[PDB]
């Protein structure tokens, strides 16, 4: 039921303003997301999959955005950079499942469209799970030519996050 959409959505918002989606009182599948070979990183930090069927989780979150290729190594706990410092920072005692898959034919046009944005300049670096949609010029585009490096190519990374009552 709940997240057949967020892994197959047609337009992910950028990392400077990501779009968290909470899901409540639905059935929790938690099996179509794993045992799929299309995912590059399947790092899960607190609790493990194949033991993720204790439906006590209420308001399961799902943050989704798009980062360039070798900046998905900033969505671990700790891991200071310019993505876990100014745009989107995970807490240190994080119990979730950061999932990242490649985007060959979806986000990289032959012209290399500049629709995506990531924030570069910000005083007072973020607390865990802090959005800042402000613009006063701190943002910059990427450029996504399809003959870039494998490390400079967009990875539509989505983070699941759990809590209890």
């Amino acid at each position, epitope marked *: 039921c709940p997240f057949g959409e967020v892994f197959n959505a047609t337009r992910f918002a950028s990392v400077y303003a990501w779009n968290r989606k909470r899901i409540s009182n639905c059935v929790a599948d938690y099996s179509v997301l794993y045992n799929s070979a299309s995912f590059s990183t399947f790092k*899960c930090y607190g609790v493990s999959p*194949t033991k993720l069927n204790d439906l006590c989780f209420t308001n399961v979150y799902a943050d989704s955005f798009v980062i360039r290729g*070798d900046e998905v*190594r900033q969505i*671990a*706990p*700790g891991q200071t950079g310019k993505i876990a410092d100014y745009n989107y920072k995970l807490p240190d005692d994080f119990t979730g499942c950061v999932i990242a898959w490649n985007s060959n034919n979806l986000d990289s046009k032959v012209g290399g469209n500049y629709n995506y944005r990531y924030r570069l300049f910000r005083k007072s670096n973020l607390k865990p799970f802090e959005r800042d949609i402000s613009t006063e010029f701190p943002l910059q585009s990427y450029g996504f030519q399809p003959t870039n490096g494998v*490390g400079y190519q967009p990875y539509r990374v989505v983070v699941l996050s759990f809590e209890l009552l």
Partner: antibody
Amino acid sequence: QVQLVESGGGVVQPGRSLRLSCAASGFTFSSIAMHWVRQAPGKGLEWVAVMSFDGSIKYYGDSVKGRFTISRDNSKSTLYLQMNSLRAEDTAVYYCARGVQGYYDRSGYYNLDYNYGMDVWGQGTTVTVSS
Amino acid sequence: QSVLTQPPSVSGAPGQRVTISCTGSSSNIGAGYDVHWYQQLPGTAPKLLIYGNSNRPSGVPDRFSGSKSGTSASLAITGLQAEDEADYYCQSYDSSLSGWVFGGGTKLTVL
């Protein structure tokens, strides 16, 4: 406030033993893995020993395979490297290095993270061994 | 001695762009694990400078950049100051020996 404190190094008769320590304060010690690395004076760095998140998974380097043993103490948040039968090459300065908090897993099997470096480094201890 | 073979001593005039190359094997870099980069000032303990082949922690400037394509990685200092005379070590992770391997360390100094 994050810093690693080290103590345990000095002069050692070759064959009788020594046990190194590495304190840690300013973060969570019982969540992050820890690495031990060393440097003979003048030459390049080398990898020695790792201990996992809890103490279940251990790996070792080729030249300390057997004469070196790592063990951590999460009660007082302290890492210990136990060494015996020192040699003429092991005269070196020893760093304990904070690993990564990654304890990632897909399809159940908890395993250490093998793509991250060693973030914060202490001043370390030196050992001197000679007959 | 080491596993990764990087040049032992490279240097350049100030205000230029010096690249410290670091090539490796088909079992560690060509496997897919990411080359990190360290900075060892003379007499100190090394600190992390670049991880994940291109990222940079807060504290290092935007001068030190990285790259990785195939079985070769390289740091790239741009517009070097006099306060960069340190030693630089490329670290990867080997899959054959199951251990983190280092580089020989390249002596960089200003001219």
